[PDB]
Every structure is written in structure tokens, then in C-alpha cells.
Amino acid sequence: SQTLLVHGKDAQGIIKQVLSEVYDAVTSTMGPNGQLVMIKNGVSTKTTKDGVTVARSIRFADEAHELVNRVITEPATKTDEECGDGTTTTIMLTHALYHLFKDFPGFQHHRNIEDLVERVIQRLESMAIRVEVDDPRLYQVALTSSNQDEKLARLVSELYANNKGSYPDIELKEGVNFEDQIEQTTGRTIRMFYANPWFAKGHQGGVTELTGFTAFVIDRRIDKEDTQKLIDGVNHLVKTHKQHLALPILLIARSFEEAANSTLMQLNAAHPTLVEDGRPWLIPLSTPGTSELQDIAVMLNAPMLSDVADLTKLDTHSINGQHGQLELGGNRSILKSTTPKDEDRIEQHARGIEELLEGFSLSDKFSVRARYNERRIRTLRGKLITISVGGETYSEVKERVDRYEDVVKAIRSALENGILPGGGVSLVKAVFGTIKEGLEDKDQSAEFAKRYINSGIANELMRLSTIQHKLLFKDTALYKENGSFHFNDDWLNTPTVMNLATGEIGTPEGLGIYDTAYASITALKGGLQTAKILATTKTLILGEK
Amino acid sequence: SQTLLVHGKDAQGIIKQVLSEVYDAVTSTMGPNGQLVMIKNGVSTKTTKDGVTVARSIRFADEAHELVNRVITEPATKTDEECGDGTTTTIMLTHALYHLFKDFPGFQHHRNIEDLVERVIQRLESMAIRVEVDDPRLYQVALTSSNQDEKLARLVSELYANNKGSYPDIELKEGVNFEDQIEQTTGRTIRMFYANPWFAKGHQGGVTELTGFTAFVIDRRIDKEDTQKLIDGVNHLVKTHKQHLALPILLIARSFEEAANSTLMQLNAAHPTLVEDGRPWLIPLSTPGTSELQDIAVMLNAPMLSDVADLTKLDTHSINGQHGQLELGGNRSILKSTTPKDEDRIEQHARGIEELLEGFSLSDKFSVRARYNERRIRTLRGKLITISVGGETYSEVKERVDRYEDVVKAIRSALENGILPGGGVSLVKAVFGTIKEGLEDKDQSAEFAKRYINSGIANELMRLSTIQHKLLFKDTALYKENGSFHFNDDWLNTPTVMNLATGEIGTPEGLGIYDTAYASITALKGGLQTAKILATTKTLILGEK
Amino acid sequence: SQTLLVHGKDAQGIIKQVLSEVYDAVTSTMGPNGQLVMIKNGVSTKTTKDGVTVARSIRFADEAHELVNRVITEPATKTDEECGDGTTTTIMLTHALYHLFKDFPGFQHHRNIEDLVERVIQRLESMAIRVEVDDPRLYQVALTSSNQDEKLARLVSELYANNKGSYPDIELKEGVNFEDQIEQTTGRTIRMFYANPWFAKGHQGGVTELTGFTAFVIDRRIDKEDTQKLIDGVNHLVKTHKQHLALPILLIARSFEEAANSTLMQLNAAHPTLVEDGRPWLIPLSTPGTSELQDIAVMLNAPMLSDVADLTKLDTHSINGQHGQLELGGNRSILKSTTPKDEDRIEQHARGIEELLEGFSLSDKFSVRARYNERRIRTLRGKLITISVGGETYSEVKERVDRYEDVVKAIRSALENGILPGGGVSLVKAVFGTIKEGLEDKDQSAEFAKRYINSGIANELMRLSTIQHKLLFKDTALYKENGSFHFNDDWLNTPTVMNLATGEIGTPEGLGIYDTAYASITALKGGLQTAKILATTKTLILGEK
Ligand SMILES: Nc1ncnc2c1ncn2[C@@H]1O[C@H](COP(=O)(O)OP(=O)(O)OP(=O)(O)O)[C@@H](O)[C@H]1O
Ligand SMILES: Nc1ncnc2c1ncn2[C@@H]1O[C@H](COP(=O)(O)OP(=O)(O)OP(=O)(O)O)[C@@H](O)[C@H]1O
Ligand SMILES: Nc1ncnc2c1ncn2[C@@H]1O[C@H](COP(=O)(O)OP(=O)(O)OP(=O)(O)O)[C@@H](O)[C@H]1O
Ligand SMILES: [Mg+2]
Ligand SMILES: [Mg+2]
Ligand SMILES: [Mg+2]
């Protein structure tokens, strides 16, 4: 607390200090050849090469430095929390693009750097190699994202390929044995669960399996206001429409407050003739994006309802009690048995969501909105699998669980969005291409030249695409010959890289080195934003009021 | 705590230091091109360009320095809290005018600077372009005050323009979805609320809806002194005048203390024949400027009463029980159903307040006295709308709620008081107008020249009106040609600026760049005083006694 | 707390600093000639030469230095916890191999050094001399591991050799006398113990001896979820199948939570007719690697059961109550009386585990997978013995107990995995052999030369195998002649060392100086990993988040 207000040269000096320091730490771990980072936590030592673990746990002494560090880190951290294996690439570009912005000052040049890089992103978005579960490149992506795990990459891509038709939902648990072990189900993970522990079998939050139910989906949150309409709706359903009904009745909703749960507890005891072996016949279920409830409505053949008063106005046309098989739970509910008739309804709805995605724009296909609709698809069409991951020690078990989870994340987002050739090649093909497109285009060559090429940003941006390919293979066999390396036309057609596991040289395509499309795009997208913010900030305020 | 008394050279040296530091930090965030500010708060980083959020959160290490900072910050902070988008302009002029005051010392010159700038405020006040909700310039103000929000400016201007007759009262909630959602009501927000939670339906502070009531507005604050007269008045109303009475009875007042609420609770229990389904038939209501209660009286057809003893001396002439529809609440009460007979009374009372604003002086029209009276008009004639603002994250939703809030505040005060051409032009036109008006006027040129032109103040002030235009457009396409820029007669007739979003050059009128009149006027008003205060201070005291 | 982020030159310097200080301290204790280390602990002084004790309790002032010290110390400490006598070796090589990694930089050389040393490991693994309990080398191993204890080594070797057939399980107690005293039993230590103290005789955790029982092994952890099925299973067993039953019933499992134990307390009280002299007839037993319960199932003739619901569906074909003799206990249970009919079942299961080890790989034979399976064999076939260790003080008794425990750990892992000739010789033979093997082989001598010999790695790695032999005998009778020492053919065929206890010179085989194979292997394996880690670290982080 010497100076709480830092403006101008000093500010940009500290920004540049923190960036370059964070850059040298995190990039050192990149690739399988990356060098290590030892981290302190109290009385132990987590020694690692995982870039996400380095990025997250770097800390600074000065509040002003740490203020900048959080701006560089929380974008890269946030990539893996949604993607899987692509954090270090984000920080690299943040550094490279920041260095660019400062090379070309004046806030027309800045707007030209934004526009050019956004057009490079579009080339990557179009480059996306779409892939099916049959494909052996899935193994290659998983082999890439696992730091060469012969055993692991083989399991997951087999597990996806062996379910050629339905997209698997995988969960992980700490295993007891040395060997791993799999637990396949024909079950669908559903996002609903108990409102109160009383509504389970045994009356204490147990896992209630059922062989028949009659579901209803409400949109509104239920609190002290709704207590009248529940008694109206429930006694209407059991008194009038008891003929076409399979117990128990599920009331699926957004939220159930403690006032509403106590009322529905009394409604179960009101009709004790329907209580078979202790099981309550009425269960309220909660879910923590209103379309995720429409899925739940569609899965269980339940009607969609907007108000709690709508339960009175119902008929056999809208009420349909399923004779399937459900497992209600405290964390989540699981549907197992689905008749061919019910799966027919769910696939037709699943095509409808895929038909919205088919016609989305190119950049819209990599949006949050798009990834949220693909989440809904996996909920509907997707079997449940539970892998108990093993190892020699407990610490290898827990370490291996993380490397399983990174792979699962990558394979899913690979076939979802796309795949690209790795080794920092796809980035170089993209930049060098986007320059050649607008320049070769005689229509806009006039102005395209005057902004980018004429100014010299094009050639700067071309040198920066190299960074990754330099970081990986500078000081290896590939770079020993011919001083540095000639990025000529002959390379651009058939791009040579080195596999750092085996040692051999060839194309990324031939050697089997692939990145996920969503990573290297979202790295660049976030890399630009965070490079801009750093480059365009001129003031730091340390005063907690 | 070295020195607790600072006089003279040392005192002004700190003021100049603090004013220059706060200037550089805040004015860097001006315009859409504006550079950013990172702010610490514990373990997070709010990075922003909003000059308010910067201004408010600047802190200084030395107590002496922070003493002066509070004086420079609180006026600019206090502009947004009543206007919406007009804070950075305040600090700019506070700097600019401080420099003017010190350039011309001696307390005859000081008096002259005030008078000249005060006449410049009048020329701004007369430049105010009055605008209807119909007008497409409302979009242009909203667009400007939103930093180019195509979606937001369109929505709020559509919402005002679709209600061409009744001025909307908007509120904002944290929305769940990606999309926004709109909740239009035919309701008027009223400032009364429950004294005690016992008086609602269910006896715990709930939202009691009613379809009939008989209100009585009291002026005085109620405490232990008034417990006798309530029992006199209440039993007089129920025993004698029960025939012309619709329950419940509303006792609206300034403040109900805990002694009086315990008495009225017993008065409800005293007559249990009138308690219809729990609802207490007597409710005391509180409000946190006595004419706001006169509005509440006119809305509910209740008689205005000075003393609590007046409740006995009443008749069927003074008492009038409404059969409308009211919703009593803990934060505020709302009236929805109003019979065309009632809105005939309310509109006539609304015109009567507009009668006072028509004939007010020009400088009186921008006062607090004026704006408070306009607050009354919106309480009387105004529908209620509640927008649940959405987005991708929680932080974007809360970020976007403020940008909604700032646009609403602007649009309201735009049509309320006026609209001016932005881009720091209007200020130049104002100063170059005021100097020429007094100079060209044959009657007062003899003395006008001797004060302002001969002493050199006019030329100083002419240069300072440029400050805003220079900060925005220096280092751009507009200032590149011909060194600096020529503010000649050719410019004053048709003033050129640069739209910083698009990059094209033109008039503020032609490009659609508009500041609110109340902002740029209250920026100057506040600029002068605060500049005066800083320039006319020669002693700082730090001692907590 | 000056800097929390150490990168590059600074990082490697501290690693080298710490390694070379930890090397100097621990290696000085090596062999019987080793020099001493005094260690503080509050208000006393443990003065020692046992390398494990040195390494573990070395600390550093700077957090950065202690960060690295944990990485050097935790591997060698973790050798003796499983192996017995082999920590200083591990550190010695960690130093040596680190040195090598730095001499040959560039990460193709790093992969070469690994592959070469990995083949040196294989040659040691093949050099492993397998040994029977009858053999007099077991004494020679013990003699080495005890720093020459004539009285101790003789006992433990005599103890294993007198039980020529069954592998003795040894435990230790602090004795009262000067002399040692032994307590032989025909008892088998079993890993089950009381869930709750209520289930023992006297109802407070006592040692309940039984002469008849009927055991049942459950796989799952038992908590509040399983309380229904236990009452279903227990009353099914006692009501239906009471004829073929010997009390008490033992419910062996993974874990019994306090909800399940309170249920079984009521089930004993439910049938008081079967309570003979206080003893509860139903005991739940817990165990803190799923195949160890299959051993417990086989030892007691109990059926293996996955679910708790399986107890209902049972028959005389699956149920068999033993009429042996068991001793239940708080820490562990003990089986004494086993009929020849039972031991036939247990020996056949033991051979079945051994037939898995017959068919393992050479490198897999030294795995934790292998060592866990061999732990199962000793539990099955293995008589119990308890030695109360004596001495002249309390401190010598406790000192001597550790040296017993090292010899037991060594002798067990010697005959388990193998024996090698000590005096640092087998390391020199292995390295000098592995070089000559690949070189001599005309098939691969083309490339083997190009990688290892031509580069100079071979000659460096050969020099480093000397390290151990140099540190023992440099500055002795063996090294005084001929300046340094010639490691020619003549030596390799008959490798001369010195017995530092006597003084005389001869072969390690002849003098009787033998290392445990598992030690000098797992030292090298660990030395390579930890050298690599140290040599490939270029970032230290001290930030406590
Ligand atoms: N065998 C290989 N040969 C060459 N390059 C490889 C190989 N495996 C991975 N890469 C490259 O290394 C880069 C990925 O590095 P790495 O996985 O260490 O960091 P990241 O994916 O950016 O972030 P994270 O720490 O989340 O994994 C990719 O550009 C990829 O092409
Ligand atoms: N597209 C544009 N082109 C040119 N000038 C613009 C544009 N948009 C806004 N401005 C100018 O920016 C100034 C307003 O600055 P800004 O909105 O950053 O701060 P403020 O309104 O003083 O306070 P606050 O921080 O509360 O918004 C006005 O003078 C206006 O003319
Ligand atoms: N009488 C002896 N003559 C020659 N060498 C010996 C003799 N006794 C032991 N050694 C050698 O000394 C080495 C063992 O030393 P030491 O027991 O101090 O190391 P360590 O086993 O790694 O440490 P710790 O026993 O604390 O785990 C072996 O190489 C062994 O061959
Ligand atoms: Mg990874
Ligand atoms: Mg604003
Ligand atoms: Mg020892």
C-alpha cells in the first residue's frame, strides 16, 4: 500500500511483467516434451506438467501484479472447465497477440487487428474436420489429449465406437483395484431429484426404484403462494381420473420450497389406501434454460405446464401414465427401461434439436447457445456408463481419474464441433491462408492490402502463427537443419511436424496428432480478447473501499 | 499523522496533485475508444470502462489526499445517481475550470468567471432540443448512452414509443434466460408500505390484494403520544359511519412507531365481526416533500388530514370508500384497477402540477424543486413494466442490468428536460455564442469587453470548451490533417466530429450522436462549483477530535 | 516471500544446491564405516548412522529449498517402508543420474539415457539370485542388513530355516529382560477385527476366543442403506437353517457404519435363547484390493457374496459352519486350530496365487501388483511368532527393535524377489554388461553405437556405476595401491571388495556381503525417475492460494 492508483507507463510495465512471467512458466510445460513445475501446498509437493494446474496456482506477491494475473489466468482456466485440454495454447496467443497490439498503436490499427484475427478464426471454424465415432482419428485425438496413453485412448474411443448410434454419458469413481473396471447400463442420466428426503422409500433420501409412474412437468418455482392450487390439482387427479393412472405421481418442477413440501407430505397421508409397502404415491422433484424441462417432459410422456392451476384442467388426452422403469435419487434420477414406442417419441424430438443446429451459422455453431442444445441431445440420446478407475497407489488412482476426464471432455467436443491437425500447424495454415484469400481476391485486394499488408500487420501476424510450432520443435531434430525453418509453399501443402513420443517426422495427419476444434478456436478467440484488454488498459486501482 | 493542519502552498499543491491524478484516470475512460481500468476488490478483478465505477472506486493513501478526492468524486458520482450517463464530463470541467480560476487570481476576477460561465449555462439551457417519445432521436440518445447497444437502445425507445401518452415506470430483475423478457402491467407504483408485518393476509408481511378499501391520509408521525386519538377516531368511524364504508380502512401516514402499531392490533381484535378471511380491516401504512402524501390522497380519493384528532369530525362528504383494486406490499403498494371516474380526478391533479412547470423560470426548470415535481407526475400518470434482463453468464446479466439502468435514466431525463448535439460540440457553440452575444450587443459591449475580453478570460474559456472535442478526437483521422484543428466560423455553423464506433466523419446531428441536456448542463454547473471550491481552499484539517 | 515464481537458471541452481547438500549428508552414513549425523528433537539428541533416519529428518530454511528436498527425500523414505535397508543407495544414484542428464542435454539424449538405464535395470532383474530358506546366504544378507549383528542375524535366519515350509509372520514387542525371548504359535494373523466393542465377550472390546463358528464374507460397505436386508438375511438364517449351524455367526465385511452396528445389536437381543454365557451370537467384522476378503473367505470356508440381499437365497451347499478355533480381537483376529481337511483347501488356493506369479513378466515380478499378491500368500500360509526384544536400557531395547524390523523386512524381500552380490559390484557388472551386450550383438551394433557409445553416454554411465564402490572403499586398503582402481576384465570375472567389519579382501560372494535384489533394483528405478524429475524441472511455485 505505497500507491493505490497506478496510471500509464507504470501500469503497462506491470502488465507486461506479469504476462511475460506467466508466459515463461506455463508454456514450458507444453507438449509431451514440456518441462516440469513444482508447486507448494502446505507440507507436500504437487510436481506437474499439466498447464491448467500451473496456470491456476501461480500467485504473485504484489496486489497490483496479482490483479493482472487474474485477468490472464481466469480465461485459460475457463477453457478447460468447458472444453478439455487447451489452456496453455490460450495463454501463448494472449502473449503473442498482446505483443502485436503494442507493435501497432493508434486505435484504427487496433480495430484492423481485431478484424483480421476474427477472419482467421472463421478459417479455423471452416477447417474443422467433422468426424464420426467409427473413425480411427478419435483414438488419435484421445492419444494426443492423454499425453500418449496407449491404454486409455484405446478404451474411450473403443467405448464410443462400440456404441455406434447413441452418445455415451461417462462418469468416474475412485477404484479399489490395479485394473480398471466398467459398468455399462442402458440408462439415461436425467437432471431431476428429490425435493425433500421424506419422499424416498424408507423416508430418508434413499434410491427409490419404480416400475410405473405418471409424470407432470411444471415450469414455475413453488413456494408459500402455490399451496392452495396443489391441493386443488392433486385431489382432482386422484378423485376424477383414477382409472387411467399408474402410481406414483411425479411432480417435476424448477424448485420446491419448504412450505410446499410440507403440504405435499400431508396429501400422501390423506389417501393411505394407495400407499403400497411404505412408498409415498406423490413426489415433488427439483432441477437447478427452460428447455431442459421440456426434454424431461418428452422423456416421460408428461405434459408441459406453465401454471400450477393447470393441473385441474386435464383429461385422458393429456394424462398418460407410463409403465416403464425409473430410479429416483438424491443427486439425480435415472431412466432405464424405455419401450420402443417411447424411444420413437424421443428420437423425433432429438432430430428437431439437430435440425436447429444444421441451419445455424458457422460462428454460431461454436457459441454457448449451440453447445447448450448439444447438451440436451446427449441427455436424451445417451447411455450411462460408470468406470471405476484403478492404479497402484491412491494418488495414481486420483491422478488417472483426471486424465480420464480430460479425454472424455475432448472426444465429446471433438465429434461435436470438429478436429484439426495438431502441432501448431492448423494455426499457420489458417493465418497464411486468410492473408492469401483477400489478397488474391481482386474485388477487395485494393483495401485489404491498404489495412493489413501495406501497414505490415499481415506479416507480423504470420510470424506469430509460427510461435506454437517453434515452441514445440525448436531444439529438436526438425529444426537442426537449415538454421531456423523455411515456411514456404512446399510446407503449406504437406506440413511436416515431429511426433515427440516416437521421434519420427511427417505430417500431423500421418503421425496421428490432432487437436480438438473447440480448443484451438476458443484459445484464439479468448487469446484476442485478453490480449486486447491487457494492451488497452492504462490504469490499476488497488483500493478496497 | 506528521502534520494535521495544512495551509497555503502545501494545501493547493495537494489539491492540484489529487485533481490532476483523478482527471487522468477517469478521462482515459471517455467515449467508446476510451482505455480501461482494472479494479481490485479482495480476490477478484472488475475491469471496466464506466467512468462512474472508476470515479467511485479511486482511493488515496494519504488522508489529506483522500480528503480532496472525496470533494472531487462525490459531485460526479452524484450526477449519475439522479441523471444517468454524465459523470466523466463533470470531472473534466472540474479540472478545466480549476485551471481557469488559478490562471486568473484576485476575487474580482473570480466573481467575473462565475458570471460568464453562468451565462454559458443559460446558453446551454436554451439550446435544449425538446423531444417527443415519437422522435427517432430518442434511439440516438439511448444508442449513445449505451456505448452502441443495437439491441438495447432499440428496445427501450420502442417501449417508450409504444406507450405514447403515459410515461413508463421501469424496474429491473436478474433474469434466468439468454433472452430478455418483458412484463407489462397497467399499474402505478405507490410509495406506501406496511408499518408492521402483522397487518398483511396470513399475519406475516405478505402481499395483500384487495378489491375495495377506504383510505385516510395523515400528515404527522405517529408514536406513543397519539394512542388516545386513534381509539377516538377508529371507534367513531365504525360505530357512526359504517353504512358508507368498504373494508379495509387504510391509515396512511409518515411514520408508525412500535407503540401505535400495538394499539391498532388490539382495535382489529376489538371488532371480530368485520374480519373477512383473516385480512385485518385496519392497516397503518408508512412512507420514507409532504406533497407525495397529497398524491397518495388524490389517487385513493382520501381526504388530506393534518392532525390525528380530525378523524372524529368527518361526514359522508369527506369520507369516500373506493371499490377499485389495490395490492399492499412490504417494499411498496401498487394500484391496478382504476375506474374512469378516478382517472378524471388524477389527470386533473397531474395537469395542475404541469401548470407550475410551464411557468417556471429557465434556470428553475433544471433545479431539484423541478425534478421532484416531475417525479410526482410519473408516480401519478405512469404504467409499470418489469424487465428481467438476461445474458450468457451471471456477471453479464448484472453488467447488462446496469447498462439498462443507465439508458433508462438517460431517456427519461432526455425527453424530460432536453437533448443536445454531442461529441463535445454543444459546449464550444455555447461559449463561442455567449462571447459573441455580449460582444455584438451594442448596449453592454462597453463593459462586457472590460470584464471578459479585455482581461483575457473569454479567450481562456474559448480554449477550454475545446477540451472534450480534443480528448475524444485527438490521435484520430479528424485531427491528423492540418496540425491541430481550426475552430472557425465554417466549423461553428456545421460542426464536424467522428463517430468512434463506425469511423466516418460528419455532424453530431447527421451521425446521430446526442448527449442528454440535463447531463451536460449539470456537468458544467457541478464543474464550476467544485472548481471554485478547490481553487478557493487554503486550509486542510485532518484531526479526528 | 521476496519472489514466489522462480524460473530457469534460478530454479535449476536451487535443485542442484539441495541435491548436493542432501547427497553429502546421507551418503556419509553409508556402510559400517559411515560417519555420524546428530539430529535435534526439542530437548534431546538422537545421534545416528541409519540413512533413512538422516534423510527423513533433513530440513531446509527457505520454502523453495524444502520444496525440492521433499522431492529428493520422499522416494528413498518410501523404499524402506516397503523394502527394508535401501535408502542411501536411492539418493546416491538420484545424484549420479541427475549429473548424467545435465552432461547430455537436448531431449533426444534424455530419451536415450532412459532407455539405456532401463536395459541396465533388466540385467539386474535377471541377475537376481533366487534363494530357499535352507540357504546359508540368508544369514549373509541379514548380517549385511544389520551392520554386522552376529546375535540377531543368526536368530532370524534360524527362525526362517527351522520353519522350512511355512513362511513365518513376525511381530515385535519391547521386552523386559537383557536376553531375547520368542513365542511360537501355530496361528495365522487375519485382517478382520471388531466393528463395535459391544460384540466381544464382556461387551467392551475384549479378546473373544471361540471353538466353533459360521462365517459369511460380504463385499459392500454397510451403512444406513442396508438395515432392511440384514434383518431379512439374519432371521432367514436362524429360522430356516438352524440345524446345520455352529454359533457364533460372523458377518465379515468391508465396513460397518454406526447405523448398521446398532441394528445387529438388536438382532442378538431378538433371539436370547442362543446367548451362551453372555457371548453375542452375531458379530460384524471390518477390514481397512478386494482379493484379501477372498482369502478370509477361503480360510474360514465362508461363501463370497457381492450384495447384502444374497444372504436370503442360501443353502447347505453354500453354508458350512466350521468347528475349528478362532480368536476375535480389536486390532486383528487370529486362527489357530485348522483341520488337515481345511489346510488342503488353503494350500490349493495358495498354489493358485503362486501359479499367477510363475507366469508374470520379469519386470512385473518386481511390481506392487506382484508384492501385494505375495502379501496374500504369507497371510494364508504363515505361522505367527512374537519376539520380545531386550537390551541394557529402554533406549537400546527400542533401538534394537528397529534393527530387528529392518532384518525381517530384508529377509522377507530377499527370498521373495532375489539376492545380488553387494559392495557396489552388481551395479558395475550390470552396466558394463549391458554396454557389451548390445555392442557385441551384430544385429543392432550399428545404432547402439550411434546412440550411446559414440555420443559418450556409455562411458559416463559406466563411470557412474563405480560411485558406490568408490564411496565404500576409496580411502581404504583396496584403493591405496595403483593410484585409483582398474576395473578391467580380470576384475569383472572375480570382483574384489573389502569387508569393512573385518578388514580382509575378497569377493562379495566369498566374504558374504549380499544386498537384497528388491533394494538395489528399486534404488536404481527410483534414482532414474527422481533424477529425470529434478533435471527436467524449470519452474518453482511457492504460492499458498
Ligand atoms: N506427440 C506430439 N507431437 C507433437 N505435438 C504434440 C504431441 N502431442 C501434443 N502435441 C501438441 O501440443 C499442444 C498441446 O499441448 P498441451 O496439451 O501440453 O497443452 P494444452 O492442450 O494447450 O492445455 P492443457 O494443459 O489443458 O492440456 C497441441 O498444439 C498439440 O498439437
Ligand atoms: N459514437 C460516438 N462518437 C463520438 N462521441 C461519442 C460517441 N459515443 C459517446 N460519445 C461522447 O462521449 C461522451 C460521453 O462519455 P461517457 O459516456 O464515456 O462518460 P459520461 O457520460 O461523462 O459518464 P458515464 O461514465 O456515467 O457514462 C459524450 O461527450 C459523447 O458525445
Ligand atoms: N561388511 C561390508 N563390507 C562392504 N560393504 C558392505 C558391508 N556391509 C554393507 N556393505 C555395503 O554397504 C551398502 C549399504 O549401505 P547402507 O545400509 O548404509 O545403505 P542403505 O541400505 O541404502 O541405507 P539404509 O540401510 O538406511 O536403508 C551396500 O552396498 C552394501 O554392499
Ligand atoms: Mg492435459
Ligand atoms: Mg454509462
Ligand atoms: Mg539398516
Numbering used by the authors:
A (entry chain C), B (entry chain D), C (entry chain B): 2 to 289, 295 to 551
Please share excerpts from the published article on this structure.
Our structural and functional analysis of the chaperonin ɸEL from the bacteriophage EL of P. aeruginosa revealed that the protein is ATPase active and functions in aggregation prevention of denatured proteins. ɸEL forms tetradecameric double ring complexes, which dissociate into a population of single rings in the presence of ATP and at physiological salt concentration. As anticipated, the ɸEL subunits displayed the typical three-domain architecture of chaperonins, composed of an equatorial domain (residues 2–130 and 425–552), an intermediate domain (residues 131–188 and 388–424), and an apical domain (residues 189–387). The domain structures of ɸEL differ from those of GroEL by numerous insertions and deletions, which alter the putative substrate-binding cleft and the contacts at the ring-ring interface.
The ɸEL heptamer in crystal form I (4.03 Å resolution) consisted of subunits in closely similar conformations (conformation I, r.m.s.d. range for Cα positions 0.28–1.36 Å). The αK-αL helical hairpin makes additional contacts to the intermediate domain. These contacts appear to stabilize the orientation of the apical domain. All subunits as judged from the electron density had either ATP or ADP•BeFX bound in the equatorial domain. For simplicity, we modelled the bound nucleotide as ATP. Intermediate domain helix αM with the catalytic residue Asp412 (equivalent to Asp398 in E. coli GroEL) was at ~6.5 Å distance to the γ-phosphate of ATP, consistent with a conformation poised for ATP hydrolysis. In crystal form I, the putative SP binding site is solvent exposed, consistent with the ability of ɸEL to bind SP in the presence of ATP. The other crystal form was solved by molecular replacement using this model. Both structures consist of heptameric single-ring complexes of ɸEL.
